[model samples]
Target: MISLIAALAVDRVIGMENAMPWNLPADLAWFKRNTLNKPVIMGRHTWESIGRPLPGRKNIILSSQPGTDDRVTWVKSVDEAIAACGDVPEIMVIGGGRVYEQFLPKAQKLYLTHIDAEVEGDTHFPDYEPDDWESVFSEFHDADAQNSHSYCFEILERR
Candidate 1:
């Protein structure tokens, strides 16, 4: 199954100026541990933001643009990336705008970190009807906690 995992605000902002706006340690740890050894897919911009392949995972980027990284598996579309994933049990759709929007419809699961604050950003997560997904595992974290942010970690399954 292919799943999209992202941390976004009420404004649907994923990042500001090509980098994450806030750093929630707990959430970051959760992301790293869960996606550590899996295939992580992202768009050209998202890939470029990090400047190199993330360790311990296969990185795939979707774009028509070119880059100097030999580690990136570049594809023109999400379907192409899915084909590249082959028989892997799961692949993570890591993102920047268009890539997330294009892949959302076909995603079997979504790991969303819904932050309580709003941020100014050029990119946003795609909108979907609430009824389209079943909110499976949902956990709400406090703003006063070690992470310093209030957020909901939701595991949404396609209905």
Candidate 2:
């Protein structure tokens, strides 16, 4: 099953620049721990933001171009991406924008961190009916608590 892991603002803005606009150590730690040994999928831009493949996790980068990174398997389409997975691989569809929408339907779970603030961005999460997602867990982390940003970790299951 595929899972989406991201944090967003009230306006649904993810980032203004190529990198993550907010810095939450808890979020980063959580992401790393959860996707550690899994097949983490991402777009070229997302991969570029990291500058290199994440250690531990089998990084499966999706891109139309080849002959770039020998460490990553460049896939032309979502089907190719899915095919690369071996026997129900634990997939984490991490992204920048377009890539998330492309794999949303196939996602069984969503690990979302909703922030209380708004941001400016050219990218946005895909539109999905709230009713279709069943919120199973949510935890609010105040700005003072993190001393960097205020956000809430919310987990939703496919309904």
Candidate 3:
């Protein structure tokens, strides 16, 4: 499966100033668990925001002017990213806004944490075709010390 993993606000905002708009450790842990030991494709901006390669996963980066990293495999385009995955059981598209936008249409699954509040953000998650997907999993989570906003963990599979 090709999966798109993201935490989005009610307004579909995913980022502000090149970073996540909200702090949700609960959601972050879920993201780590889901992408563990999997090939993950992301844009350079996302990698910069993260500050380092994610351990235990193949970090395939898409950048026009790529930088060097022993832990990362840099690619220039979508085709190169897919090529680098080399028949992995699944590849996670973990993104900045444009990377998600570029891959959204072709993604077979979505792992989303939906923040209940509307947020002010510069970057928004791409709009997708609702008719093309069906909900496969969902659960509501309440705000806590680690999570500032009530949110829903939602999964969708292409139909």
Candidate 4:
């Protein structure tokens, strides 16, 4: 199964200057919980945003740069990264816009945190046709002292 995981704001904003505009530890924890033990594929810029490979998961990076790292396998394209996974049953495409667009059509599931507030951002989550997917799960989270905005942990499966 191929899946995507992202935090999107009310206006579909995903990032600002290569990083998320908000800080929500609960959302981060949610991402870790779902993606752990699965191979994760990401664009070079997405890898750069995280600064290093995520531990406990196989890191597959799509990049044109000539580089080597003990933590990651650098592939030239998405197809190459998927093929490199060998027998892994599920792979995650964590994003930075372009990578999401490339994999959106093929993704079977989406684990998303929908933030209630609009954010000023340069990057965005690609718009999808709601009729093509079904909401399998969702739970709302109220804003608190620690988390600044109301949000929902939502799961969507392609129809």
RMSD of each: 1.5, 1.5, 1.1, 1.0
Clashing pairs in 2: none
Candidate lDDT values, in order: 0.86, 0.83, 0.90, 0.90
The TM-scores, one per candidate, come to 0.92, 0.93, 0.95, 0.96
* Top-lDDT candidate index: 3
Instruction: Tell me how far the alpha carbon of residue 125 in candidate 4 is from the true structure, in angstroms, after superposition.
Output: 0.8
Judge candidate 3 against the unseen true structure and give its global Cα lDDT, from 0 to 1: 0.90
After superposition, candidate 1 runs with Cα above 4 Å error: none
Error of 1 at 119 (Å): 0.8
lDDT of 2 by residue, 1-159 (tens): 889988787678776678767777778887887789888888988888889889987788888888387887778889888878776656889887989999898998999988777677877888877988999999887777664778788899999
Q: List candidate 4 stretches off by more than 4 Å.
A: none
User: Global lDDT for candidate 2?
Assistant: 0.83
State the displacement of the C-alpha of residue 112, model 1, in Å, after optimal TM-score superposition.
0.3
What does the lDDT read for residue 141 in candidate 4?
A: 89
Which of the predicted structures, 1 or 2, would earn the higher lDDT when compared with the native? Answer: 1
Task: Give the range of the ten consecutive residues with the poorest summed lDDT in model 3.
Answer: 15-24
